């Protein structure tokens, strides 16, 4: 699902996160920055798990409550 890069939101890791499922989730260290690509799940459903792109370049899902949106 597309979007205007220009209203893109960024986030910061509040805590370390270890992927229980490396195929669907990405790792985070407190403090890391990432771009929120989508807040839906792989099925377009609302989700407490969001798809993001981190600094190292990995794409995947992280727990919404482990991050803070920068505004």
């Amino acid at each position: 699902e597309p979007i205007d890069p220009s209203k893109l939101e960024f986030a910061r890791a509040l805590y370390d996160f270890v992927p229980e499922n490396p195929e669907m989730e990405v790792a985070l260290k407190k403090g890391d920055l990432m771009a929120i690509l989508s807040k839906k799940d792989p099925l377009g459903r609302d989700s407490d798990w969001w798809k993001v792109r981190t600094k190292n370049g990995n794409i995947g899902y992280i727990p919404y409550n482990y991050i803070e949106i920068i505004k």
Partner: peptide, 10 residues
């Protein structure tokens, strides 16, 4: 000290 993880569907 780490927040509870939200339920995931996979």
């Amino acid at each position: 000290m780490p927040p509870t993880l939200p339920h995931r569907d996979w």
